Amino acid sequence: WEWNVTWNTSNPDFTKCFQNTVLVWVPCSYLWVCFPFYFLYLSHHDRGYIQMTHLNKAKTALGFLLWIVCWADLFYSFWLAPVFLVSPTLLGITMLLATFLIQIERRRGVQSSGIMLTFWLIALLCALAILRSKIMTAVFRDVTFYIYFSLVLIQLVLSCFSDRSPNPCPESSASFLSRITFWWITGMMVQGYRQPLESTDLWSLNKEDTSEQVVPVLVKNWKKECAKSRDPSLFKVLYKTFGPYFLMSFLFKAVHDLMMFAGPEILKLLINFVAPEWQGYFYTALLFISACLQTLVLHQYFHICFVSGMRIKTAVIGAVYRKALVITNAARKSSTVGEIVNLMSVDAQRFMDLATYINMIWSAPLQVILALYLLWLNLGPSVLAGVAVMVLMVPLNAVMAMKTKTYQVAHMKSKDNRIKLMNEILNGIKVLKLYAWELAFKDKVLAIRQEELKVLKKSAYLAAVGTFTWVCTPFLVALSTFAVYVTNILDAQKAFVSLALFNILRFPLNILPMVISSIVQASVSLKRLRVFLSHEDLDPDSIQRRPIATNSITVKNATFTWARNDPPTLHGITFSVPEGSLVAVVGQVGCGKSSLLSALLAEMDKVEGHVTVKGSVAYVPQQAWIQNISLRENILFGRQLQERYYKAVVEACALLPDLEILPSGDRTEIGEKGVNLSGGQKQRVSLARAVYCDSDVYLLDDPLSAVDAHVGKHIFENVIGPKGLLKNKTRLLVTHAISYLPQMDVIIVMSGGKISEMGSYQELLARDGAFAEFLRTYATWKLVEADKAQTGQVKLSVYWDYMKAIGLFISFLSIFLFLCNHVASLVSNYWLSLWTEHTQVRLSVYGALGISQGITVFGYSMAVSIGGIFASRRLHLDLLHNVLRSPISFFERTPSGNLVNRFSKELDTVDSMIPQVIKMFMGSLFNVIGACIIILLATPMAAVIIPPLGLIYFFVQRFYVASSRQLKRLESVSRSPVYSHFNETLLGVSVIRAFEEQERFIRQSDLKVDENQKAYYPSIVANRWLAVRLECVGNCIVLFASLFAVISRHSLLVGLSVSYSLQVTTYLNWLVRMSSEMETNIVAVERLKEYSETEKEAPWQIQDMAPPKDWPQVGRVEFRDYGLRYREDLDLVLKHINVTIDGGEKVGIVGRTGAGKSSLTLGLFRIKESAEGEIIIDDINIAKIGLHDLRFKITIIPQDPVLFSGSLRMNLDPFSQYSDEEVWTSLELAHLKGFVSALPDKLNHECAEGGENLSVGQRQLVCLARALLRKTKILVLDEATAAVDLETDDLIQSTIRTQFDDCTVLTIAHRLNTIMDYTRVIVLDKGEIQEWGSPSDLLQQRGLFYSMAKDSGLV
């Protein structure tokens, strides 16, 4: 090796020894270092074995022949030079390793081999170099090399084709080149360019990325962690679950780092070249191939990080779902629904963000410590000053990082609260609007959001300070280093060969703050998720659930408690129910009857006892849980359809007439929460679902409380009673009605939480006890609309909405600071680059401009972020207004997964992602403008080609967004259902656990997450594909310029026209990518604004048509016809009703279940707009009155008692306009004073999510108490005495008559004994007033009211 023949001569020729040693050691060596490592992948990852094909054999045979040929050389050498022995033998054995490797790759099922192809490419290049040398030299050993080269070339061509396999994702069958360049998606790219992409065009998820192949692994690792603990560290299972695949990104990152620092070296040598021409010709090809390899390796790395992050999100969502399924009630109360929604919606987004920066945590300092080494051999140990200054920032910024962490914690917590509150608003929206409480809860959510945004603003301030100090650190590194060095000297050369590296070193310092912020957010997320996954899970084992002694349900001294901290609810429970025995659990409000049933379901923590429940359990919750599936799928509940039994169950449960009056019968969609159905129909559907599932034990909790006497008797005789379908099954019937007690085989009285009395009706009527006194006293359609993805470019109105929310001043402040920051850098660059009194009057200028840059970097960092606070403060508020203003029909048709999506994930994207992405987009755009100015001032003749360079880039940008947006849109549209499922799963956890349908719901959640990732994975693959092409465009303008600067070296600066072209292509690549990122992120604002155009309710307050202050003073409600139609696709439910309710008239709207009684109440409050007719209350038409002017003047006690999570006093009046003394009085007339007073927290008692902390009787009492609090001249009593005992029932009626004595009251009830005291009643059968007079007159008429009183036992 000497420079005369290798570099100095115009003939590019290697030396003979170099040819025979290094050129042969390179490829053989590559396979030797990779071979061992490759067994790891070949072993850990398997896909079967490929069959015997001609291609595989062709490759194997050529591997055998190639080895022979190489050993044939050793034979001829055996037949002086030392290299003529070792080299042929080494090549033969590495060749024997190559053929063995394709053999084992066949065995392990790999169609395209990256190793073989790259290995053959390197061998080919080495052979090409020797080939050219051997053909320039000119039989004996040359012909062996020609045979070797031809065989190697054919082997390389063969290695490109993909072998046979052992809406599929093309990656599973793509060739090696297709996957290294992400070509397997280009088909969807052009498709997505001709028509908008839909979910149908999207490919099915890869097997490795599928939820049921990812979540289980994480669950198993977590279970192994917990076993070791008996705290379990979530981080341990994380890398024990995601490192085996992620660690290859370390190799890709290292290779990319090495080659990205090697590239500029080649650039500098090339621009120094403009040294025989060949030198530059080689220089440009080497630079081109190194750049292309850099892009490919960096981009496969990015893909690995993104796929690992997506798998992390899938695993986190699945684990959260499973834990929520197995969670206990105490932990479920502790970890609110908002917290679970945050964990599964944006907590894994933090991990996804981390996945891109967890590889930079070691790369940044690697480049840093190298630059110090480059600077060292450049200058000397004076850098001790520089390293110290850089080190000083680490703790200083870490201190702030710690502070930021706290903020994030608080922030995350505030977020949970907000989401939890929103969930309550979604669940009790009908009650919220009926009570005119939309404004109060809007203000509550606004206060929570303001607190969360203040915390986020402080966190953004600290992040801006950290970014500022990190950006000013390198300027200090230099300033301090030169400062100590002067006290050799700083020759313009030595001094400035150090400044260039300082700029190179400032890259990691600029990227660090992002890494720190992502790590802090991911650490907070890990903490929240580890705390959740470590929550106590209820033990089913506690209830010996023996399969089918004959004592179906036996209990021995059970002390069940809802939580360990709280006192036990069940005190010494002990009873034994024989098989097939009808059991009624009677009692007053809040005595643990539903607690007893949930204790038999293992939903209650057992302090001590022995409970054995034998046989399958079928449970019906007092509040019926209904999913979005139709009635047939609700009754089936994932069961095989048997028409003979399904029809019998439907007919027996008195559900047939309701199906007759339903539009599509039993196939019509039923709504997210059963809001389509009535209370009685909901209860009947839940009971029929339990009955159809043939179980051995049926725990019925008030299944006939919301149905009339006739339908209740029909159901009991045909389903529950001794002559019903359930006659052979043990049945625990928790009921308050005592009409069916004589039929009961065993009656258990639950008083104070314990078994006060046990026996039959005839046994308890002779004991002469408390229950004896109680008995003596006798007192398809497709309703839901799924999320829709917009088809087209996002409207510029969305960008305007995000800009006008930020504000004019903040927007220009930010644009001006961006422009100033990038101008300052360009001045600093021009002051150093071209202009390279120097000491003190030039290096200082570099520091001065540099500091002037950092402050501006700080400036917009504090200007965009606060803008992100402003817009998120507006975008949410309008949304919070827009959602509430929407009518009840909107919440009916829109599932509670779109509304949660806007408030959880799209809002999060608006909060944090969009401001940062806007910041980076503005930075890239101004960088491109600055580069355009730079290359315009220098060589203005080149300005002709500047627009074309941009034009082509523009086209690529367009060609990409037309697909990319849709993918993002589809991702959001594919994410809305998942939330819904969680909500549904969170609403009916007890039902799912009791029916043992946990596995089916787990599979449904896996399917929904699989759809979401089917939408999301093509998005990241699209980013990679676009990026490869964009960077390749640059590398093919760098090489092309590098070519045109070496073709014009002695002709009319060319060398700076490459280093200009490359920088302009880079800036352009970043610009096209960041514009695509901003365009995709604006989809979040476009989904938030989607609800703005949604039709909403009538104006809340009509100023002109305001009623008098004392408007309902008479309360003379007068319907004219008031036809009611929920949607303009169904039949009327209030066809031509004419009532003339007088002032202060006790009127009772009684009728059969599902007749339209509560539709009257919904129409009185204008909740559902009238189809034909009007209501003139006190000579004032409500159609004309303002919405609040109507709803604030009329009280209602809703059928479904919903208590929003929070303080009990907050539930009684969220407006907080009643004094605590008055609220105490209102609780006293509700017969709840004792219960609230024995509570440890008194009125500040925290109600659970949806009020589950209280019994439904106590929730009805709370509704009555808040009705007493309002107490206007119109009271609507929508079945208030529906799930309360007879003693409480009469107490409620007594106080109602007492307090509501001079106000018009419209009472809908199935208990006719509460309506006989009413002056007149309204009888409803099919939305028609059949009988309209006094109850005595109707009884004389012997009509339908008489019959209803007959089934009620009142005659």
Ligand X SMILES: Nc1ncnc2c1ncn2[C@@H]1O[C@H](COP(=O)(O)OP(=O)(O)OP(=O)(O)O)[C@@H](O)[C@H]1O
Q: Do strands 1304-1308 and 1274-1278 pair parallel, antiparallel, or not at all (unpaired)? A: parallel
User: Cα 998 from chain centroid?
Assistant: 21
3-class DSSP assignment, residue 1204: coil
Give the x-and-dash track for 1268-1297 against ligand X (CB under 6 A): ---------------x--------------
Distances in whole angstroms, Cα of residue 198 to Cα of each of 965, 980, 1014: 12, 21, 11
Buried b (16+ CB within 10 A) or exposed e, 1105-1123: eebeeebbebbbbbbbebb
Tell me whether residue 380 or residue 1234 sits nearer to ligand X (CB atom).
1234
Q: Which two tokens stand for residue 1116?
A: 């003379």
480 contact choice in Mg ion, ligand X, none (CB below 5 to 8 Å, kind-dependent): none
Shortest Å distance, C-beta 1148 to Mg ion: 14
Which amino acid would we find at residue 1225?
Answer: T
Q: Does 990 bind Mg ion (CB under 5 A)?
A: no
1309 touches ligand X by CB under 6 A: no
Q: According to CB under 6 A, which one of 88, 280, 466, 592 is a site residue for ligand X?
A: 592
We find the least distance from the C-beta atom of residue 989 to Mg ion, in angstroms, to be 17
Binding residues for ATP: 587-594, 1151-1158
Could you tell me which stretch among 4-12, 499-507, 675-683, 1011-1019 binds Mg ion (CB under 5 A)?
Answer: 675-683
CB of 641 to Mg ion, least distance (A): 30
Contact between 814 and Mg ion per CB under 5 A: no
Distance CA 1096, CA 885 (A): 6
Q: Which of 699, 691, 700, 683 is nearest to 652 (CA)?
A: 691
| Strand locations in 1152-1273 (E) | 1170-1172, 1176-1177, 1180-1181, 1195-1197, 1206-1207, 1246-1247
Helix, strand, or coil (residue 199):
coil
Stretch that binds ligand X, among 254-262, 420-428, 648-656, 677-685 (CB under 6 A): 677-685
Closest alpha carbon to 1024 in 368, 568, 375, 356 = 356
Alpha carbons 1199 and 623: distance in angstroms, whole number = 11
Tell which positions 1239-1258 bind Mg ion, by CB under 5 A: 1255
Least distance from ligand X to the Cβ atom of residue 312, Å = 33
For residue 681, state whether it binds ligand X (rule: CB under 6 A): yes
Q: Is residue 594 near Mg ion by the rule CB under 5 A?
A: yes
CB nearer to Mg ion: give 1158 or 1226: 1158
Q: What angle do CA 322, 328, 333 make, to 5 degrees?
A: 105
- Indicate the residue among 320 and 677 with the shorter CB distance to ligand X: 677
Tell me the per-residue interface mask from 870 to 909 with ligand X, x by CB under 6 A, - otherwise.
----------------------x-----------------
**C-alpha dihedral (543, 545, 551, 557), degrees to nearest 10:** -10
Distance CA 1329, CA 1332 (A): 6
Minimum Å gap between C-beta 750 and ligand X is: 7
Contact 1293, 1277 (CB under 8 A): no
CB count, 10 Å around CB of 698?
A: 26
Q: What is the token pair recorded at 253?
A: 């990152």
Question: Restricting to residues 1035-1054, which ones interact with Mg ion according to CB under 5 A?
Answer: none
Contacted by 1153, from Mg ion, ligand X, none: CB < 5 to 8 Å by type: ligand X
For the record, the structure tokens of 923 come out as 């930075």
Residue 306 or 1204: which CB sits closer to ligand X? 1204
Q: Is 1155 in the site for ligand X (CB under 6 A)?
A: yes
> 1320-1324 and 1146-1151: which strand pairing?
parallel
Q: Is 594 in the site for ligand X (CB under 6 A)?
A: yes
Selected binder of Mg ion within 356, 569, 676, 1199 (CB under 5 A): 1199
# residues contacting ligand X (CB under 6 A): 43
Place of tokens 């024989």: 578
The two tokens of residue 803 are 């800009």
* Closer residue to ligand X in complex, CB, 691/748: 748
| The entry of Mg ion, ligand X, none that residue 787 binds, CB within 5 to 8 Å by partner kind | none
Among the listed residues 683, 896, 1158, 1314, the single contact to Mg ion using CB under 5 A:
1158
State yes or no: residue 976 binds Mg ion (CB under 5 A).
no
Tell me whether residue 221 or residue 594 sits nearer to Mg ion (CB atom).
Answer: 594
Measured on CA atoms in the order 494, 495, 499, 502, is the torsion positive or negative?
A: positive
Single out the residue of 102, 1064, 1254, 1349 in contact with ligand X (rule: CB under 6 A): 1254
The long-range contacts involving 374-380, CB below 8 angstroms and separated by at least 24 positions, are 374/501, 375/481, 375/498, 375/501, 375/502, 375/505, 378/494, 378/497, 378/498, 378/501, 379/481, 379/485, 379/494, 379/498, 380/485, 380/488
Residue closer to ligand X (CB basis): 1155 or 1275: 1155
- How far is Cα of residue 275 from the mean position of the Cα atoms in its chain? 60
Identify the residue among 1157, 1166, 1193, 1209 touching ligand X (CB under 6 A).
Answer: 1157
Site for Mg ion in 921-950 (CB under 5 A): none
Q: How far apart are CA 1168 and CA 1174, in angstroms?
A: 12
The distance of closest approach from Cβ of residue 1124 to ligand X in the complex, given in angstroms and rounded to an integer, is: 9
Q: Is 676 in the site for ligand X (CB under 6 A)?
A: yes
CB nearer to Mg ion: pick between 464 and 991 = 991
Among 87, 427, 1023, 1159, interactor with ligand X by CB under 6 A: 1159
Q: Which does 674 bind (CB under 5 to 8 A by kind): ligand X, Mg ion, none?
A: none
Stretch that binds ligand X, among 527-535, 741-749, 874-882, 1251-1259 (CB under 6 A): 1251-1259
Q: Which residue is nearest to ligand X (CB)?
A: 1257
Identity of the amino acid at 1270: R
DSSP letters spanning 463-525: HHHHHHHHHHHHHHHHHHHHHHHH-----HHHHHHHHHHHHHHHHHHHHHHHHHHHHHHHHHH
- CB nearer to Mg ion: give 789 or 1167: 1167
231: its two tokens: 């705290």
Binding residues: 587-594, 1151-1158
Q: Determine the Cα–Cα distance for residues 903 and 1031; give it in Å rounded to an integer.
A: 37
Query: Read out DSSP for 204-225?
Result: PPPTTTSHHHHHHHHHHHHHHH
Q: Which stretch binds ligand X (CB under 6 A): 296-304, 509-517, 592-600, 1067-1075?
A: 592-600
Q: Binding marks (x or -) toward Mg ion, 1103..1122, rule CB under 5 A?
A: --------------------
Phi-psi label, residue 1216: left if phi above 0, alpha if psi -120 to 50, beta otherwise: left
Residues 187-206 contacting ligand X, CB under 6 A: none
Q: In whole angstroms, give the CA distance from residue 1095 to residue 598.
A: 42
Whichever of 528 and 673 has its CB closer to Mg ion, that residue is 673
For Mg ion, the closer CB: 318 or 1156: 1156
Q: Shortest distance, CB of residue 587 to Mg ion, whole angstroms?
A: 9
Write out the binding residues for ligand X, residues 286-325 only, by CB under 6 A: none
Q: Which residues, 110 to 169, sit near Mg ion by CB under 5 A? A: none
Window 194-213: contact mask with Mg ion (x via CB under 5 A): --------------------
Interaction partner, residue 587 (Mg ion, ligand X, none; CB < 5-8 Å by kind): ligand X
Q: Record the tokens describing residue 401, joined without a space.
A: 């990082």
Per-position x/- string for 626-655, each x denoting binding to Mg ion as judged by CB under 5 A, each - no binding: ------------------------------
Which positions touch Mg ion (CB under 5 A)? 594, 622, 679, 1158, 1199, 1255
Which positions touch ligand X (CB under 6 A)? 329, 562, 569, 587, 589-595, 622, 661, 675-681, 706, 892, 1126, 1133, 1151, 1153-1159, 1199, 1248, 1252-1258, 1283, 1308
